[PDB]
C-alpha cells in the first residue's frame, strides 16, 4: 500500500468527523446480573474486537439512544442463532462513544459509533410496551490463567525463568533458535510430569500468538509486526473479529471464555482448508486466501453503514472472480475516501456480492480492489 493512508477507513469520515465524543469507561463487575436494552434492527455477531457504526430512522430507537446517553450509554447486541424465531443465548455489550443528531427533512436521524466490551449470557427477554427489548444479562468473566508450570516449578529453577529479550521474529529467519531455547528453558520442569514439552507449548499463549502472526505474514505480505496487539486477550479478539467465517463459527468463538482456547480455535480455523464462495452456488469460487489484504488498521474486514442504515461486513481483496459490474463508478458515500464504487453480482446468482472500488487519483498504488460483503460468502472446505 503506497500513497494511501490506512487511518482514513477506520475513522468513518463518511458518517462525519464532527461527532461529539464521550470518554469515561463503565464496566459491570464480573458475574453479576444486569438489565440492558437491545436494538431491534441489528442482527449481527458483535465481537469486542470490532466497532459498530449505526444510523437509525424510526423514532423509538432515537428516543432510546437519546435517554440512553444518560444511562451509561451501554446497550446489548444479541447473537441471533436463527433470524426467524430471533432467539439468542449470548451477546456483547457496547457503549456509544460517538453520537450526533440531525433534523434533515424534518425527521430526527441519529448516527452513533459503538465498540464491544463484555460478553454475557441472556436469561429472559422482556418485550416493552414501548416496543424496545430489554434483556436480563449475566456477565461472563474473563478467564486469565497462570503459566502451566507454576504448579510444579522447582524453587531453584525460578531463578532461571527470566529470559533475555526476544530478537526480530519476522521474515523467515525470525527467532527460531530463540524459540527452541524458550521451549527448553520454560518447560524444563515438564520432566516432573507425564507430558512432553511440545504438548505444553501447544497450550502456551506466546507461542500460539507467534504461530498466528507467522501464518498471517505469509498471505498478507505487507503486514508489519506492530499492527497486532501484544496482549493475548486483545490479540485473540482482534483475530476473531478479522476472520471471515460463518455465524456458527463466530458464536462458537464468542462462547469461549479463555484466551488459550480462543487462540487454539483460531489456529484450527486458519489451518483448515478454505476458499471463499458465494453461498447460492458453492461451486462458484470468488476469492482465495492469497488475495486478501488489510486496507485499514482494523484488518481486511470491518463494519460500515450505507445511507439506508444497513450494515455490511466488507472484505477487501485484490482479485475477486465471478463478478458482474453494473453501472458507473460513483462517490456519493465514501467508506474508503478517494475511491468510487460500482455494484457487483455473480455471473449466475444475479445476487449482490459487493462493489468494485476504482481509484480516482492517478497515483495511488492499490488502484483497483474489491469489497465483498460477508453475508453473501461461504468458506467452502475441499
Amino acid at each position: 500500500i503506497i500513497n494511501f493512508d490506512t487511518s482514513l477507513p477506520t475513522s468513518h469520515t463518511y458518517l462525519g468527523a464532527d461527532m461529539e465524543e464521550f470518554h469515561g469507561r463503565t464496566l459491570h463487575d464480573d458475574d453479576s446480573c444486569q438489565v440492558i436494552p437491545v436494538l431491534p434492527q441489528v442482527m449481527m455477531i458483535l465481537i469486542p474486537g470490532q466497532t459498530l457504526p449505526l444510523q437509525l430512522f424510526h423514532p423509538q430507537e432515537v428516543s432510546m439512544v437519546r435517554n440512553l446517553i444518560q444511562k451509561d450509554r451501554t446497550f446489548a447486541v444479541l447473537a441471533y442463532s436463527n433470524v426467524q424465531e430471533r432467539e439468542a443465548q449470548f451477546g456483547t455489550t457496547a457503549e456509544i462513544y460517538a453520537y450526533r443528531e440531525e433534523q434533515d427533512f424534518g425527521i430526527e436521524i441519529v448516527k452513533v459509533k459503538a465498540i464491544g466490551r463484555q460478553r454475557f449470557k441472556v436469561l429472559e427477554l422482556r418485550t416493552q410496551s414501548d416496543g424496545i427489548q430489554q434483556a436480563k444479562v449475566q456477565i461472563l468473566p474473563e478467564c486469565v490463567l497462570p503459566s502451566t508450570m507454576s504448579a510444579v516449578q522447582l524453587e531453584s529453577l525460578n531463578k532461571c525463568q527470566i529470559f533475555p529479550s526476544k530478537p526480530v521474529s519476522r521474515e523467515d529467519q525470525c527467532s527460531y533458535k530463540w524459540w527452541q531455547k524458550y521451549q527448553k528453558r520454560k518447560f524444563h520442569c515438564a520432566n516432573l510430569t507425564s507430558w512432553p514439552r511440545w504438548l505444553y507449548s501447544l497450550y502456551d499463549a506466546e507461542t500460539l500468538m507467534d504461530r498466528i502472526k507467522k501464518q498471517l505474514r505469509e498471505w498478507d505480505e505487507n503486514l508489519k509486526d506492530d499492527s497486532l496487539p501484544s496482549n493475548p486477550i486483545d490479540f485473540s479478539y482482534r483475530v476473531a473479529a478479522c476472520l471471515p467465517i460463518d455465524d456458527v463459527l463466530r458464536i462458537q468463538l464468542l462462547k469461549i471464555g479463555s484466551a488459550i482456547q480462543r487462540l487454539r480455535c483460531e489456529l484450527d480455523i486458519m489451518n483448515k482448508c478454505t476458499s471463499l464462495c458465494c453461498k447460492q452456488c458453492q461451486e462458484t469460487e470468488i476469492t482465495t486466501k492469497n488475495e486478501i489484504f488489510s486496507l485499514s488498521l482494523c484488518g481486511p474486514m470491518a463494519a460500515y453503514v450505507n445511507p439506508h442504515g444497513y450494515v455490511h461486513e466488507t472484505l477487501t481483496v485484490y482479485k475477486a472472480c465471478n463478478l458482474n459490474l453494473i453501472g458507473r463508478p460513483s462517490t456519493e458515500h465514501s467508506w474508503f475516501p478517494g475511491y468510487a464504487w460500482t455494484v457487483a453480482q455473480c455471473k449466475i446468482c444475479a445476487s449482490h456480492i459487493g462493489w468494485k472500488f476504482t481509484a480516482t487519483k492517478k497515483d495511488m498504488s492499490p488502484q483497483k480492489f474489491w469489497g465483498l460483503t460477508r453475508s453473501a460468502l461461504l468458506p467452502t472446505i475441499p
Binding site: L145, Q153, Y176, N191, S194, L202
Partner: protein, 802 residues
C-alpha cells in the same frame, strides 16, 4: 458415593529446603529439613543425623530461615506458607515433652497484586531488625522484628524495578541495605537500596553497577571481613563492592548452570556451588581485609541437588527433589577427582512418580512406580518396605504382563550429537546393557537428542532382558498390555508420535504391537495414523485410541491387522482417557471433561454429558458409574457427578467436591487389596513422592466424620496457629472456596494420639448414630474403635525418631 475419604499412606520425601543452626539448644548443631508440609529436626553427631522432632504443618513451606534476635539464648524459626501464612517458632523441652511454640503469626496476603514470576523470596537482615518478602511484582514487604509485633504487621515499599531476579541483605552496613539484580530493556543490572524503618522508604545505596553478565541469576552475600556480594552467572563469577570489581570466567562451569550455594566457614572464605547436572564446586576467596582473587575447583559428582548445607567437619548434606538425598564426606584425597566426594549415607526419595501399577494381589498387592529423572531414574517396589532398582535413565510409563512375567517400561535417555553425525551417550544406562537389543529401522552439533526405548524387565530379578529403540524423532507416549479379539496371545501396544522441531502439531504417528516370546521381542503389527497417540485403552476386546482430537476404536482381525470400526470427532485434545464398562471419560489439559458411551447396536459413540471450565488439569479417574475424580489447578481435588436430581440437566456434570491437597497428582490407579465402612480404593502418586488413598463413604459416616472433624479442630493445637478449614479450602486465583464432600483422614487419625481427657471433651455431647439402630451418647471407646477400623485401610508406618 459423592463423599470421599483422603488419607496419606507415604509421607512426602522430596526436600525443598534445609538450614543449619542452634535451634534445640545453644550447644547443639541442628539440621532442619523441609519436605512438603513436613518439618524434620536433626541433631548432628559424629555418627550421622539423630532425628528428634517431626511436625506437620498446615501448608506448603515456601520460606525457612533461622534468626537470633538480641536477648535470645537460641535461634527462632521463620516459616512462610504458599498461602502466605507466616509464623515465628520456638523450641521448648520440658522433660520428655517437646513442643514447638508459636511466638507470632499472621497472614501477609495482599488483596490486589500479581504473584512474581521468580517466586517467593524471604530474607532476614544479619542484625535481626526486619524481614523482607518479595511476593508480588513491584512491591517489597517489610515486617519489623520488635518484641511487640505479635501479629506481624507489615508495610509495602515500592520497587521501581519490576523484573527482579534475586534479593539479598548485605553484611557490615550501619543501615539495612539490600542488593538485587533486575532486568530492563537495557539489560541486567545490580543495585543497592537502604531501608529506613522510621520514615518507611528506600534511600540511595552505596553503589550501583550497570555492567552485569546477561545470565546473572544468583546473589551471594559475603560476611563482614570482606563484605559486598558475589553474582553467579552462566559464564562469570563477579565480586562487587565499593571500588572493588573482581571477575573470573572459569571454563569448568560453562557446561551447566549453578542453582544452589552454601557457606562453609563463618568467615566467608569458602563456598559450595551446585549445578543442575550433579557436580559439586568449591569457590575459594583469597585475602590479604581485602580480596585478591577467586578460584573454582571441582570436587566430584553427587545427586542432582536442590539445596546444600555444610555440617560439622567435612560432612555435607545434599537435598534432592529428583533423587535420593545424600550425606557426603569431603576428603582431601583424590580417588578420581580432586578432593573427591565419598558417599556415607543415602535417604529414600520416591520423587516425581510419573506412572504406577499394582501387581501380585494375593499374599497383599504390590505397588511399582516410575520414579526420578535423568540419572536418578529408578523403579520403586513398595509393599512400608521399599526396594530400589536403578535404571540411570528417565522412566515414563509402566505396565505389567502376567503371562510372560515381565514389566514393560517406556524410557528415554539424553544423547549428544558427535561431529560425525552420530549420537553418543554420556553414561551407561539400562537401555545400553540389555541382553538383547533391536532397532525399528537401521539408520545413522553438540545438540541434545532424546532417544526413546521400550524395556522388558523381569519380575523376579528386575534385570533388563530386552531393549527396543524407536525411529529418529519418535516419541513414545502410551503403553498398554491386553488381549484383542479372539486371539489368546498377550501383546504390548505402544503409541508413538513423530515430532520435528519445525512444526508444533505432530502430523504423523504410529501404533506398534509387540509380542514377547522365547526371550525375544517380535513386532506383530504396525499401523500408521495421521496424528499423535496421546492415550490408548482396552475396551471390551477392542483398542480405543486417541489420535489428536479424534477418538477411534480398533478391531483385531484374524490376519493380525488393526481395523477401524467407529470414529468420533471432538473439539478438544484427548489427553486423558478412562473406561468403565460401556462408558468412556475424555479430558484435555484444560479441564474440559467429556463423557461418552459406546452403543453396540449401532456401533457409534454418543455424548452423554460434559462440563467445560478452564483450568489446568493433571489427572482423572473414574470412581464409579456416576462419580468422576480429578486433580485441579494449584494443588486441589474435585469430584463431579451425572444425572443428579429435562435434557439440559442430564447433559450437565454437576460439581460435588473440592479439597486442597497440597500435592501435584500425576497418576491414579485402582488398588484395594494392596494393603488387604468404605467402598472402592484409588491410589495416587504425586511429584513430592507422596502416595495417598481415596475411598467412598455413605451418608451417616460422612456426617459423623465431618462433625468429628469440626470438634477436633477446637482441641488440636496447630503449629503456627493456621486454621485447618483455611488450609483445606479450595485455592486457585480469582476465588477461594470451602471444602465440600471430602474428609481429611489425617485429622481423624490424629484422634488416636491425643490424651484421654482431651478425647473425652472431643466426644462429649456427640449423639452417636450406632449401626444397631438406636442413637445414644458417644463414649470415647466407640470412637476409638471407629477410628482404628478406619486406620485399618492403609499401611503401617516406620519409626522416625531415635
Amino acid at each position: 458415593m459423592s463423599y470421599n475419604y483422603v488419607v496419606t499412606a507415604q509421607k512426602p520425601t522430596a526436600v525443598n529446603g534445609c538450614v543449619t543452626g542452634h535451634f534445640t539448644s545453644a550447644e547443639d548443631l541442628n539440621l532442619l529439613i523441609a519436605k512438603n508440609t513436613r518439618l524434620e529436626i536433626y541433631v548432628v553427631t559424629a555418627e550421622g543425623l539423630r532425628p528428634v522432632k517431626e511436625v506437620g504443618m498446615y501448608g506448603k513451606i515456601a520460606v525457612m530461615e533461622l534468626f537470633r534476635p538480641k536477648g535470645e539464648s537460641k535461634d527462632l524459626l521463620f516459616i512462610l506458607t504458599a498461602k502466605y501464612n507466616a509464623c515465628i517458632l520456638e523450641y521448648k523441652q520440658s522433660g520428655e515433652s517437646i513442643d514447638i511454640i508459636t511466638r507470632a503469626h499472621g497472614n501477609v496476603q495482599d488483596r490486589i497484586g500479581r504473584p512474581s514470576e521468580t517466586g517467593i523470596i524471604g530474607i532476614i537482615d544479619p542484625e535481626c531488625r526486619m524481614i523482607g518478602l518479595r511476593l508480588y511484582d513491584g512491591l517489597f514487604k517489610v515486617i519489623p522484628l520488635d518484641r511487640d509485633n505479635k501479629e506481624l504487621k507489615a508495610f509495602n515499599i515500592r520497587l521501581e524495578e519490576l523484573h527482579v531476579i534475586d534479593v539479598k541483605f548485605l553484611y557490615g552496613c550501619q543501615a539495612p541495605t539490600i542488593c538485587f539484580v533486575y532486568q530492563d530493556p537495557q539489560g541486567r543490572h545490580v543495585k543497592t537500596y537502604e531501608v529506613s524503618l522510621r520514615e518507611k522508604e528506600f534511600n540511595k545505596g552505596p553503589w550501583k553497577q550497570e555492567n552485569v553478565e546477561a545470565e546473572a541469576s544468583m546473589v551471594i552475600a559475603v560476611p563482614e571481613p570482606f563484605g559486598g556480594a558475589i553474582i553467579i552467572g552462566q559464564e562469570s563469577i563477579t565480586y562487587h563492592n565499593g571500588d572493588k570489581y573482581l571477575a573470573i570466567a572459569p571454563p569448568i562451569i560453562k557446561q551447566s548452570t549453578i542453582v544452589c550455594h552454601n557457606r562453609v566457614d563463618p568467615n566467608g572464605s569458602r563456598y559450595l556451588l551446585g549445578d543442575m547436572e550433579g557436580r559439586l564446586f568449591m569457590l575459594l576467596l583469597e585475602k590479604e581485609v581485602t580480596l585478591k582473587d577467586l578460584r573454582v575447583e571441582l570436587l566430584g559428582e553427587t545427586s542432582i541437588a536442590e539445596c546444600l548445607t555444610y555440617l560439622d567437619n567435612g560432612v555435607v548434606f545434599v537435598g534432592s527433589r529428583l533423587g535420593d538425598s545424600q550425606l557426603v564426606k569431603l576428603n582431601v584425597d583424590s580417588n578420581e577427582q580432586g578432593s573427591y566426594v565419598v558417599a556415607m549415607e543415602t535417604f529414600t526419595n520416591l520423587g516425581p512418580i510419573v506412572d504406577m501399577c499394582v501387581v501380585d494381589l494375593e499374599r497383599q498387592g504390590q505397588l511399582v512406580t516410575c520414579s526420578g529423572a535423568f540419572k536418578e531414574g529408578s523403579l520403586r517396589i513398595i509393599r512400608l518396605h521399599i526396594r530400589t532398582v536403578p535404571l540411570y535413565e528417565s522412566p515414563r510409563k509402566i505396565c505389567y504382563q502376567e503371562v510372560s512375567q515381565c514389566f514393560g517400561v517406556l524410557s528415554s535417555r539424553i544423547e549428544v550429537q558427535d561431529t560425525s553425525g552420530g549420537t553418543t551417550a554420556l553414561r551407561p544406562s539400562a537401555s545400553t546393557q540389555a541382553l538383547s537389543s533391536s532397532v525399528s529401522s537401521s539408520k545413522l552439533f553438540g545438540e541434545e537428542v532424546e532417544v526413546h526405548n521400550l524395556l522388558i524387565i523381569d519380575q523376579h530379578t528386575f534385570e533388563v532382558l530386552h531393549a527396543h529403540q524407536f525411529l529418529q524423532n519418535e516419541y513414545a507416549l502410551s503403553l498398554v498390555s491386553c488381549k484383542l479379539g479372539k486371539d489368546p496371545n498377550t501383546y504390548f501396544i505402544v503409541g508413538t508420535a513423530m515430532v520435528y522441531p519445525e512444526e508444533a502439531e505432530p502430523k504423523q504417528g504410529r501404533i506398534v504391537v509387540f509380542q514377547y516370546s522365547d526371550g525375544k521381542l517380535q513386532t506383530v503389527a504396525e499401523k500408521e495414523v495421521k496424528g499423535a497417540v496421546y492415550s490408548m485403552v482396552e475396551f471390551n476386546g477392542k483398542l480405543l485410541a486417541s489420535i489428536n482430537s479424534t477418538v477411534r476404536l480398533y478391531e483385531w482381525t484374524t490376519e493380525k491387522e488393526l481395523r477401524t470400526e467407529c470414529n468420533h470427532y471432538n473439539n478438544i485434545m484427548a489427553l486423558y482417557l478412562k473406561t468403565k464398562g460401556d462408558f468412556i471419560l475424555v479430558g484435555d489439559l484444560m479441564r474440559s471433561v467429556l463423557l461418552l458411551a459406546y452403543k453396540p447396536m449401532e456401533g457409534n459413540f454418543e455424548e452423554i454429558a460434559r462440563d467445560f471450565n478452564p483450568n489446568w488439569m493433571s489427572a482423572v479417574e473414574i470412581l464409579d458409574d456416576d462419580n468422576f475424580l480429578g486433580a485441579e489447578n494449584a494443588f486441589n481435588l474435585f469430584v463431579c457427578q451425572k444425572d443428579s436430581a429435562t435434557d439440559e440437566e442430564r447433559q450437565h456434570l454437576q460439581e460435588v467436591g473440592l479439597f486442597h491437597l497440597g500435592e501435584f497428582v500425576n497418576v491414579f490407579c485402582h488398588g484395594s487389596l494392596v494393603m488387604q465402612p468404605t467402598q472402592g480404593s484409588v491410589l495416587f502418586g504425586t511429584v513430592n513422592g507422596m502416595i495417598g488413598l481415596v475411598t467412598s463413604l455413605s451418608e451417616s459416616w460422612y456426617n459423623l466424620l465431618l462433625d468429628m472433624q469440626n470438634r477436633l479442630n477446637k482441641v488440636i493445637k496447630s503449629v503456627g496457629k493456621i486454621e485447618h478449614s483455611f488450609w483445606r479450602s479450595f485455592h486457585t486465583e480469582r476465588k477461594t472456596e470451602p471444602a465440600t464432600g471430602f474428609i481429611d483422614g489425617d485429622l481423624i487419625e490424629s484422634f488416636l494420639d491425643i490424651s484421654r481427657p482431651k478425647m473425652q471433651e472431643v466426644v462429649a455431647n456427640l449423639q452417636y448414630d450406632d449401626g444397631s439402630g438406636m442413637k445414644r451418647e458417644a463414649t470415647a471407646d466407640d470412637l476409638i474403635k471407629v477410628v482404628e477400623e478406619l486406620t485399618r485401610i492403609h499401611w503401617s508406618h516406620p519409626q522416625f525418631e531415635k
